[model samples]
Target: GLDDPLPTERLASEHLKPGCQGEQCPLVNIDTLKFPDEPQLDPIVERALLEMTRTPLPASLAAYERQFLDSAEPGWSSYLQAKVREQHDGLVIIELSSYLFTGGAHGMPGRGFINYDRRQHKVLSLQDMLVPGQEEAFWKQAELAHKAWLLANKLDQDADFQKTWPFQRTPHVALTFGAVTLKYDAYSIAPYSYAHPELKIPYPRLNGIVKPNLFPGR
Candidate 1:
């Protein structure tokens, strides 16, 4: 076993400050991991974070600069921020979120989840943590979880809520201490007015549906 514990250090970015000045400059910010003992975990997250950025930061900055200079708006900004959400029990969750404002009525906001299994040495999809034959059963629970979300938000009282935001399967799952969260993209399960929807299913409810090893001694 490695000597130090997982995530011996957490890192933050102060990038783009020296090269650019003023509030009009586009922003690229991230919070990344450093596991002194678990070397492999570091790059596993780093590689995925890079992919999430899509357009490189410098390029995004350049694009913003061009747009800003053309119209010269003080509020123009493009942002990408990745931060660790949770880590425990050989599982780590990171949230990569972004917002962009170039030429729209409002900026676009987005988010994605990353769940890494330290022992397995890979990222996990919803299917990866479930019993092979239990996919439908898992969805059954997901449906209930969705209803819980709707009711919690008081949308259950609206007769047309379900017709507009019918439940759909989402790949964005985040595994945490006592629950698994299903993260929905904006306008995926609900309108942008509802903000993003997330259904948290408690481990007890999942019971035989999830893989036994995914949460040992729970």
Candidate 2:
């Protein structure tokens, strides 16, 4: 009996519904993202959860409203999905993997991550994950790492991507308590389809620049 209320309770909270503009358009859906409550939901996780739990409501409305624009096409579908890509430090991650279709040749793909420090009780920033300073040194290693990726993928730069290509000094991080893992901005250093750059700096390689306190195991 109680489970029945859960659906309406959640729906009423957001009031988001499916609607379309172009003829024969399929209904679009936006499902808000929520973090785990297993242990860290209240860092006190209070400080962290308060800010983190509030992420989807305002932003997702913007994501959903775009599909109703005049450009929407028949059978157009706008969608959003999330996952816990990793869990460690006995904590969790909220990976936003989403797409929006506006009756175009293709939909824009959006990807990102969020993690809160269970012990610290705050959202982790790019600087939060690293030792103080060394920003330039980190950039140098990242450039080399990107060089390796192009070679590994056998990508060519008829000027599409280059050794000197620019990457975001601040990157969206992945589950890397044990290692350094980062995903660069889309089109930051390569062709949109083939050049989304990712860099993984192992614990050993990160000794000087990375905050060792994050890697307790090592």
Candidate 3:
């Protein structure tokens, strides 16, 4: 039987530094979800969110802040927006996407996943979900999915596409009841214009590589 959706509360905060002027001031904005009902999951999610999103000014952004303070030209901003993407069969998928602007041509955006297993009482990494020795096999399937993605996007004709956007093995993944989606931030698989590329492979295709019982009933 399917479980009801986990109860979540919105927790948000924003900070603006005093030194910077005008619209592009030094700012940190965080808006994310918290699981209030599940004691086991709430702490785990809280710690994960803290480790990723707590910092108002990270080292990289601090450098830009220094530059802005000295030159009065550039500005910096950081954001973390986490939301529950999927929840079913004792598995909860949280997508934590972030953006940082440190005065480059444009701000850099990225996405990540926190796969929490209620049965295991911990967050699951990509390796944790796979068959112990079948990691390479999993990557093979992921590569095929990438190829399919390229074909669908009509980039398969580009002779240099593979070289330009080489698919490295990543630990980022989002697991649903039916499919496991491989996630890549901008500039990993393609240009920033392509944004974050997600390749979804069905459970049947993953077969022996992915552990069964991750999600039952197809």
lDDT of each candidate versus the true structure? 0.71, 0.53, 0.74
Identify the superior model by TM-score, candidate 1 or candidate 2. Answer: 1
What ranking emerges by TM-score with the best candidate at the front? 3, 1, 2
Model 2: per-residue Cα lDDT over 170-205, one tens digit each: 456765555566776556665577534677766676
TM-score of each: 0.78, 0.66, 0.83
Q: Could you tell me the TM-score of candidate 3?
A: 0.83
Clashes within 3 Å, all models in order: 0, 4, 0
Error of 2 at 139 (Å): 1.7
At residue 9, candidate 1 shows an lDDT of 78
lDDT of 3 by residue, 1-218 (tens): 13677788987877677655578667777776767666776555555545453435334333433433454334777776788888888788988777877788887776788888777777888778888999888888898888888999998888698888787766688887667898887788898888888897878888888888785554
Comparison by lDDT, 1 against 2, better one: 1
Model 3 weakest 10-residue run by lDDT: 53-62
Q: For model 3, what is the alpha-carbon lDDT of residue 23?
A: 85
The residue-by-residue lDDT of candidate 1 on 1-218, one tens digit each, is 32223655766653443345777654444566667766876666566555543544323333533443455345555555556787777776778776667657987777788887777778888789888899999999999999899889898888687887788998778887767888887888888977778798888888899997776345
**Best candidate per TM-score, number?**
3
Error of 1 at 211 (Å): 0.4
